[PDB]
Coordinates of all heavy atoms in Angstrom, one line a residue:
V8 N 6.2 20.1 -8.4 CA 5.2 19.4 -7.6 C 3.9 19.2 -8.5 O 3.4 20.3 -9.0 CB 4.9 20.1 -6.3 CG1 4.5 21.6 -6.5 CG2 3.7 19.4 -5.5
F9 N 3.4 18.0 -8.6 CA 2.2 17.7 -9.4 C 1.0 17.7 -8.5 O 0.9 17.0 -7.5 CB 2.3 16.3 -10.0 CG 3.4 16.1 -11.0 CD1 4.5 15.4 -10.6 CD2 3.2 16.5 -12.3 CE1 5.5 15.2 -11.6 CE2 4.1 16.3 -13.3 CZ 5.3 15.6 -12.9
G10 N 0.0 18.6 -8.8 CA -1.2 18.6 -8.1 C -2.3 19.2 -8.9 O -2.1 19.8 -9.9
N11 N -3.6 19.1 -8.3 CA -4.7 19.8 -9.0 C -5.8 19.9 -7.9 O -6.5 19.0 -7.6 CB -5.2 18.9 -10.2 CG -6.2 19.7 -11.0 OD1 -7.0 20.4 -10.5 ND2 -6.1 19.5 -12.3
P12 N -5.9 21.2 -7.4 CA -5.1 22.4 -7.7 C -3.7 22.4 -7.0 O -3.4 21.5 -6.2 CB -6.0 23.5 -7.0 CG -6.5 22.8 -5.8 CD -6.8 21.4 -6.2
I13 N -2.9 23.3 -7.4 CA -1.5 23.4 -6.9 C -1.0 24.8 -6.6 O 0.0 24.9 -5.9 CB -0.5 22.7 -7.9 CG1 0.8 22.4 -7.3 CG2 -0.4 23.6 -9.2 CD1 0.7 21.5 -6.0
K14 N -1.7 25.8 -7.0 CA -1.1 27.2 -6.9 C -0.9 27.6 -5.4 O 0.0 28.5 -5.1 CB -2.0 28.2 -7.6 CG -3.3 28.5 -7.0 CD -3.2 29.6 -6.0 CE -4.2 29.3 -4.8 NZ -3.7 30.0 -3.5
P41 N 5.7 24.7 -9.6 CA 4.5 24.0 -9.5 C 4.0 23.5 -10.8 O 4.2 24.2 -11.8 CB 3.5 25.1 -8.9 CG 4.1 26.4 -9.4 CD 5.6 26.2 -9.5
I42 N 3.3 22.4 -10.8 CA 2.8 21.7 -12.1 C 1.4 21.4 -11.9 O 1.0 20.5 -11.2 CB 3.6 20.5 -12.5 CG1 5.1 20.8 -12.7 CG2 3.1 19.9 -13.8 CD1 6.0 19.6 -12.6
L43 N 0.5 22.2 -12.5 CA -1.0 21.9 -12.4 C -1.2 20.8 -13.4 O -1.1 21.0 -14.7 CB -1.8 23.1 -12.8 CG -3.3 22.9 -12.9 CD1 -3.9 22.5 -11.6 CD2 -4.0 24.2 -13.4
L44 N -1.4 19.6 -13.0 CA -1.6 18.4 -13.9 C -3.0 18.2 -14.2 O -3.8 18.1 -13.3 CB -1.0 17.2 -13.1 CG -0.2 16.1 -13.8 CD1 -0.6 14.7 -13.3 CD2 0.1 16.2 -15.3
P45 N -3.4 18.2 -15.5 CA -4.8 17.9 -15.8 C -5.1 16.5 -15.3 O -4.3 15.6 -15.3 CB -4.7 17.9 -17.4 CG -3.6 18.7 -17.8 CD -2.5 18.4 -16.7
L46 N -6.4 16.4 -14.8 CA -6.8 15.1 -14.3 C -6.6 13.9 -15.2 O -6.4 12.8 -14.8 CB -8.2 15.1 -13.9 CG -8.7 15.5 -12.4 CD1 -7.6 16.2 -11.6 CD2 -10.0 16.2 -12.4
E47 N -6.7 14.1 -16.6 CA -6.5 13.1 -17.6 C -5.1 12.7 -17.9 O -4.9 11.7 -18.6 CB -7.3 13.4 -18.9 CG -6.7 14.4 -19.8 CD -7.1 15.8 -19.4 OE1 -7.6 16.1 -18.3 OE2 -6.8 16.7 -20.3
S48 N -4.1 13.5 -17.4 CA -2.7 13.2 -17.8 C -2.1 12.0 -17.0 O -2.8 11.4 -16.2 CB -1.9 14.5 -17.6 OG -2.3 15.5 -18.5
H49 N -0.9 11.7 -17.2 CA -0.2 10.6 -16.7 C 1.0 11.1 -15.9 O 1.9 11.7 -16.6 CB 0.2 9.6 -17.8 CG 0.6 8.3 -17.3 ND1 1.9 8.0 -16.9 CD2 -0.1 7.1 -17.3 CE1 2.0 6.7 -16.6 NE2 0.8 6.2 -16.8
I50 N 1.2 10.8 -14.7 CA 2.3 11.3 -13.9 C 3.7 10.9 -14.5 O 4.6 11.8 -14.6 CB 2.2 10.9 -12.4 CG1 1.0 11.6 -11.7 CG2 3.5 11.1 -11.6 CD1 0.7 11.1 -10.3
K51 N 3.8 9.7 -14.8 CA 5.1 9.2 -15.3 C 5.4 9.9 -16.6 O 6.6 10.3 -16.9 CB 5.1 7.7 -15.4 CG 6.5 7.2 -15.9 CD 6.6 5.6 -15.8 CE 7.8 5.3 -16.8 NZ 8.1 3.8 -16.9
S52 N 4.4 9.9 -17.5 CA 4.7 10.4 -18.8 C 5.1 11.9 -18.7 O 6.0 12.4 -19.4 CB 3.5 10.3 -19.8 OG 3.2 8.9 -19.9
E53 N 4.4 12.6 -17.8 CA 4.7 14.1 -17.7 C 6.1 14.3 -17.0 O 6.9 15.2 -17.4 CB 3.6 14.8 -16.9 CG 2.4 15.2 -17.7 CD 2.9 16.2 -18.8 OE1 3.5 17.2 -18.5 OE2 2.7 15.9 -20.0
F54 N 6.4 13.5 -16.0 CA 7.7 13.5 -15.4 C 8.8 13.4 -16.4 O 9.8 14.1 -16.4 CB 7.8 12.4 -14.3 CG 9.0 12.5 -13.5 CD1 9.0 13.0 -12.2 CD2 10.3 11.9 -13.9 CE1 10.1 13.0 -11.3 CE2 11.4 11.9 -13.1 CZ 11.4 12.5 -11.8
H56 N 8.5 13.7 -19.8 CA 8.4 14.7 -20.8 C 9.1 16.0 -20.3 O 9.8 16.7 -21.2 CB 6.9 15.0 -21.0 CG 6.7 16.2 -21.9 ND1 6.1 17.4 -21.5 CD2 7.0 16.4 -23.2 CE1 6.1 18.2 -22.5 NE2 6.6 17.7 -23.6
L57 N 8.9 16.4 -19.1 CA 9.5 17.6 -18.5 C 11.0 17.5 -18.2 O 11.7 18.5 -17.9 CB 8.8 18.1 -17.2 CG 7.3 18.4 -17.5 CD1 6.6 18.7 -16.1 CD2 7.2 19.6 -18.4
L59 N 12.3 16.0 -15.6 CA 12.5 16.2 -14.2 C 13.5 15.2 -13.6 O 13.7 14.1 -14.1 CB 11.2 16.0 -13.3 CG 10.0 16.8 -13.8 CD1 8.9 16.7 -12.8 CD2 10.5 18.3 -13.9
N63 N 7.5 16.2 -6.2 CA 6.5 15.8 -5.2 C 5.2 15.6 -5.9 O 5.0 16.1 -7.1 CB 6.4 16.9 -4.1 CG 7.6 16.7 -3.1 OD1 7.7 15.7 -2.4 ND2 8.4 17.7 -3.1
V64 N 4.3 15.0 -5.2 CA 2.9 14.7 -5.7 C 2.0 15.0 -4.6 O 2.2 14.6 -3.4 CB 2.8 13.2 -6.1 CG1 1.4 13.0 -6.7 CG2 3.9 12.8 -7.1
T65 N 1.0 15.8 -4.9 CA -0.1 16.1 -3.9 C -1.4 15.7 -4.5 O -1.5 15.1 -5.5 CB 0.0 17.6 -3.6 OG1 -0.9 17.9 -2.5 CG2 -0.4 18.4 -4.8
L66 N -2.5 16.1 -3.8 CA -3.8 15.7 -4.1 C -4.2 16.2 -5.6 O -3.8 17.3 -6.0 CB -4.8 16.5 -3.2 CG -4.6 16.5 -1.7 CD1 -3.1 16.9 -1.1 CD2 -5.6 17.4 -1.0
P67 N -4.9 15.3 -6.3 CA -5.5 14.0 -6.0 C -4.7 12.9 -6.6 O -5.2 11.9 -7.1 CB -6.8 14.1 -6.7 CG -6.5 14.9 -8.0 CD -5.4 15.9 -7.6
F68 N -3.3 13.0 -6.6 CA -2.5 12.1 -7.4 C -1.7 11.1 -6.7 O -1.0 10.3 -7.4 CB -1.6 12.9 -8.3 CG -2.3 13.8 -9.3 CD1 -2.0 15.2 -9.3 CD2 -3.2 13.3 -10.2 CE1 -2.7 16.0 -10.3 CE2 -3.9 14.1 -11.1 CZ -3.6 15.5 -11.2
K69 N -1.7 11.0 -5.4 CA -0.7 10.2 -4.6 C -1.0 8.7 -4.8 O 0.0 8.0 -4.9 CB -0.7 10.6 -3.1 CG -0.3 12.0 -2.8 CD -0.5 12.4 -1.3 CE 0.0 13.8 -1.0 NZ -0.4 13.9 0.5
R71 N -2.4 7.4 -7.6 CA -2.0 7.2 -9.0 C -0.5 7.1 -9.1 O 0.1 6.3 -9.8 CB -2.5 8.3 -9.9 CG -4.0 8.1 -10.1 CD -4.7 9.4 -10.6 NE -4.0 10.0 -11.8 CZ -4.6 10.9 -12.5 NH1 -5.8 11.4 -12.3 NH2 -3.9 11.3 -13.6
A72 N 0.2 8.0 -8.3 CA 1.7 8.0 -8.5 C 2.2 6.6 -8.0 O 3.2 6.1 -8.6 CB 2.3 9.1 -7.6
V75 N 2.0 4.1 -10.9 CA 2.7 4.3 -12.2 C 4.2 4.4 -12.0 O 4.9 4.4 -13.1 CB 2.2 5.6 -13.0 CG1 0.7 5.5 -13.3 CG2 2.7 6.9 -12.3
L92 N 8.9 11.6 -5.9 CA 9.4 10.9 -7.0 C 10.9 11.2 -7.3 O 11.2 12.4 -7.3 CB 8.6 11.2 -8.3 CG 7.1 10.9 -8.2 CD1 6.4 11.6 -9.4 CD2 6.9 9.4 -8.3

Side-chain angles (χ1 to χ4, degrees):
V8 54
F9 294 102
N11 189 324
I13 196 56
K14 71 89 218 154
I42 302 158
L43 175 64
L44 219 222
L46 266 18
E47 78 273 15
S48 294
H49 191 275
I50 288 172
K51 182 175 162 181
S52 297
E53 276 299 306
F54 187 103
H56 174 248
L57 297 173
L59 308 188
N63 282 297
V64 182
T65 189
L66 310 52
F68 297 124
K69 299 172 178 177
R71 289 161 54 165
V75 303
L92 301 165

